[PDB]
Each structure stands twice: as structure tokens, then as C-alpha cells.
Amino acid sequence: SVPSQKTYQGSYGFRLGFLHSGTAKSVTCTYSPALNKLFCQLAKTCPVQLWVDSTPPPGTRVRAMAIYKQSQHMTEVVRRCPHHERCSDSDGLAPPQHLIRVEGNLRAEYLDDRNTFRHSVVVPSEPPEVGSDCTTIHYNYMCYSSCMGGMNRRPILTIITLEDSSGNLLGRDSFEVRVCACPGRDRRTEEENLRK
Numbered sequence: 567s568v569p570s571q572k573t574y575q576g577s578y579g580f581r582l583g584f585l586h587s588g589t590a591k592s593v594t595c596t597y598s599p600a601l602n603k604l605f606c607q608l609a610k611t612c613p614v615q616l617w618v619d620s621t622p623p624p625g626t627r628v629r630a631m632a633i634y635k636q637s638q639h640m641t642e643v644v645r646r647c648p649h650h651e652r653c654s655d656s657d658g659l660a661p662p663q664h665l666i667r668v669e670g671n672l673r674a675e676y677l678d679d680r681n682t683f684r685h686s687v688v689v690p691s692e693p694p695e696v697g698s699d700c701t702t703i704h705y706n707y708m709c710y711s712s713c714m715g716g717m718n719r720r721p722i723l724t725i726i727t728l729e730d731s732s733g734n735l736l737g738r739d740s741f742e743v744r745v746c747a748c749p750g751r752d753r754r755t756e757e758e759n760l761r762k
């Protein structure tokens with residue numbers, strides 16, 4: 567009733583990477599290594615790098631799923647709030663209830679789990695292009711952390727899993743997410759709070 571969040575590189579050395587976007591007031595997405603936390607604006611591009619030490623088999627996939635970080639909320643499905651699930655901002659593929667979308671991948675699939683009712687979005691794993699050392703998935707988060715009746719100011723984690731063609735686990739990584747109006751200021755504030 568709760569997905570695992572244990573980091574697991576697995577046989578292929580799977581792990582995530584993030585750009586170094588800084589903390590200017592204007593930044594739309596920024597990652598804090600010290601907090602393992604992504605700060606982003608609503609429905610803005612969040613580039614997440616996928617790194618492996620060796621290429622997994624054809625048919626490998628990469629799944630993203632959100633869970634609440636606090637234990638007393640972890641059994642609750644993370645979903646869009648009653649406002650945003652009705653605002654008709656569909657990309658033609660993502661169900662309007664799903665918090666996490668993938669941008670610009672026509673092979674993305676959206677799952678409503680028939681047993682847990684949790685949402686996820688999955689894409690094929692592909693090796694890096696010629697001259698590149700990793701691949702990047704562009705995610706969008708479609709509600710604010712503060713949305714009433716949805717996340718309701720509760721922190722969430724995103725769990726990224728590398729899966730074989732049957733859905734079996736090959737690798738796992740994760741990061742906290744805050745969706746907010748001013749990611750640069752909020753990253754600076756929370757990093758200062760950690761230091762203090």
C-alpha cells in the first residue's frame with residue numbers, strides 16, 4: 567500500500583542527475599543537492615537526467631510516481647486538486663487527475679493502478695544519443711504544493727524506477743519536490759534553514 571523509496575542502482579548503475587540552474591528569483595526549476603529536493607514552478611519543464619553505467623535491455627522503461635513524504639499521509643494517493651483536475655489543460659494524453667506529466671514523448675503511457683489507484687507515467691528507456699553521456703526526461707508538475715484539497719502543503723517525493731518489460735524492478739532513485747511560485751527564493755530559504 568506504499569511504494570518503496572529505497573535507492574537502488576541495480577545491475578546497470580541507474581541514478582538521476584540534475585542541472586545546476588542557480589537560485590535567481592526568475593529561475594523556473596532548480597535542484598538542491600543538500601536537500602535532495604527539486605523546486606519548480608507550476609507546469610514548467612523539469613529536466614531530469616538518467617545515468618547508467620551499462621545499457622539495459624531493449625524494452626526497459628522509466629516510471630515516475632509521486633507519494634507523500636510524511637508517513638501519516640503515505641497511503642493517500644497523490645493527485646491533482648479539485649480545481650486543477652477540472653481546468654481542461656489536457657495535453658491529449660495525460661489524464662486530468664495526474665500530477666506528473668512527461669513533456670514531448672509520444673510513447674509516454676499513463677497508468678491508473680487497478681489495485682492501488684496510484685498514478686504514474688512511464689516511457690521507454692533509450693541509450694544516449696551520439697556524443698551524449700546521458701538521456702533527459704522533461705517532467706511537469708501540474709499542481710502547487712499548496713493546492714487546497716490536493717497536496718494541501720504536504721511535501722511529496724517523486725520515485726523514478728527503471729523497470730524491465732514486465733514491470734520488474736531494475737533500479738530506483740527519488741527526490742523531494744516543492745511546486746511553488748518562486749523556486750529560487752524557496753531553495754535559498756530552505757538551504758539556509760538547513761545550515762542554521
Ligand SMILES: [Zn+2]
Binds near residue numbers: 648651714
Ligand atoms: Zn491544484
